[PDB]
Symmetry: C2
Subunit: 293 residues, 2 copies
């Protein structure tokens, strides 16, 4: 298994500043950070058809930095930005504002409670946040798994997920942020030359990979879901290993392809939920077998 963390550029409800805040985490299974700094119960990562379409889109044209010889976020950021600009992924004048934002405080659950929650925000050409124009709303994950404050069976069952992170594993950080001056969604993927522990992550697991998903507020794209797909992709072994072994973007893309090719889609059905989802078992079992070819 592996530990993956998802953080989003947000505006804190209190001071109204602009920080990064943890939204979900994986250790195979996924957990969602509630509005009150309380973790949602673990669950299987289901993804929207859209997030996989977009991920495939944005990755096929992604900026890839393999064996980046950096051990800091500032070091990675400066580098990722130089490649972005270079690949015409972003404009030269966006750099100063994007670096500054990427280097903000990367808050975690424990701070959420003190800050009095956090709000959705959009980075501007001045560095000031701005509420997104297009209508905002709590995700399915929050609506479904975030109605606790304390786990029903046990107020700390969610913490039990952390009990599954392997003795010698590495982590992945997925950063999701919106900037109004950006012309389109961009995907940045980095593999550190040597695993480095970053102060941006919740727990001290050495970081090996980073996904940076940035873009302007566009009507047909949900960045939280794009993030969840990226993280869920990294949480899959066959991919994770291809990610360790790839020597170019194409090898990663070829792997994303198998992941997609082995994903199962269960359209809207009125059939009895348990049987409806117990039906996937024999099918999934085969696709799972095909992935491991």
């Amino acid at each position: 298994k592996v530990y993956v963390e998802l953080q989003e550029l947000v505006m804190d409800e209190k001071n109204q500043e602009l920080r990064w805040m943890e939204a979900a985490r994986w250790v195979q299974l996924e957990e969602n950070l509630g509005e009150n700094g309380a973790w949602g119960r673990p669950h299987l990562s289901h993804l929207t058809f859209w997030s996989l379409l977009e991920l495939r889109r944005v990755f096929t044209k992604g900026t890839v930095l393999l064996d980046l010889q950096e051990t800091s976020l500032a070091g990675v950021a400066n580098q990722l930005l130089d490649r972005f600009i270079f690949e015409d992924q972003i404009r030269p004048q966006d750099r100063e504002e994007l670096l500054r934002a990427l280097l903000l405080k990367h808050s975690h659950a424990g701070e959420l409670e003190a800050l009095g929650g956090v709000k959705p925000a959009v980075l501007t050409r001045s560095g000031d946040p701005s509420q997104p124009l297009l209508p905002q709303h709590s995700s399915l994950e929050t609506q479904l798994f975030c109605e606790q404050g304390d786990g029903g069976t046990e107020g700390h069952s969610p913490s039990g997920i952390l009990e599954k992170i392997p003795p010698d594993s590495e982590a992945t950080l997925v950063l999701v942020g919106r900037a109004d001056f950006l012309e389109q969604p961009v995907l940045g993927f980095v593999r550190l030359q040597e695993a480095a522990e970053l102060e941006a992550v919740e727990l001290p697991v050495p970081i090996r990979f980073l996904f940076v998903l940035l873009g302007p507020e566009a009507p047909h794209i949900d960045y939280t879901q794009l993030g969840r797909a990226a993280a869920t992709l990294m949480s899959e072994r066959v991919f994770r290993i291809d990610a360790y072994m790839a020597q170019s973007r194409g090898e990663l893309l070829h792997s994303l392809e198998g992941f997609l090719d082995c994903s199962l889609v269960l359209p809207p059905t009125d059939a009895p939920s348990e049987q409806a989802l117990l039906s996937l078992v024999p099918v999934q079992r085969e696709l799972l077998r095909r992935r491991y070819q």
Copy 2:
């Protein structure tokens, strides 16, 4: 009511080597697949591949739609459809002759399968001749984990049981899928008859109300069988069916497809222990179902 859908494919019978359409699967909410032996497999929930859906969406968006078409024969539908394809630039004037004859080839069913010994994957040649696909063929997942039951064991003709669920006043849908390596791109034709007319092409005399004609060249990321399954599965979904009957343009059909996709749950590859499945595979399934029926006058029926 629960529309009976049948999916047929342009195929080549092993013995005679002739071309013809052979029934591949049928739906009455649940899906069954025709085993290579002419034997129906168990009815199951339709699970679709991400690619069959992306392709269905791409083709539906540029789809040739004929609503309330005043025709009562497959041939009558074919001529109109082909004339519409050409006008909308889905096919060339030179491709009509070959595509019409093809659409009008024999439409065989399971019983015929046994008699023919079997059929083999085919591609329509520019000269109307059958040809083996260029890309290496393979057994579909459905034919693998469902079909091989046809022998009559502790349940004789149990899959027939699905036929028991066809409503007393239901209309059907025909999904025809075929590869013509001379077409320049895949194309989708969607037809809604002014009046449901029964057609010999269908296994059962249920009045055909809709048709999906998906034709094209062998292209990457495009399994025509799976694309067929996606269209037939879309039709079998209550909210889309009701939109398909109300639609007065392609837009309404596409809006419904959007909703179908929004409410679809993609379950990525991973080690499958039932306990770990249900957690999302229950409350999430419920939410997507609830969202799907939110604006539709339909009602979920287990």
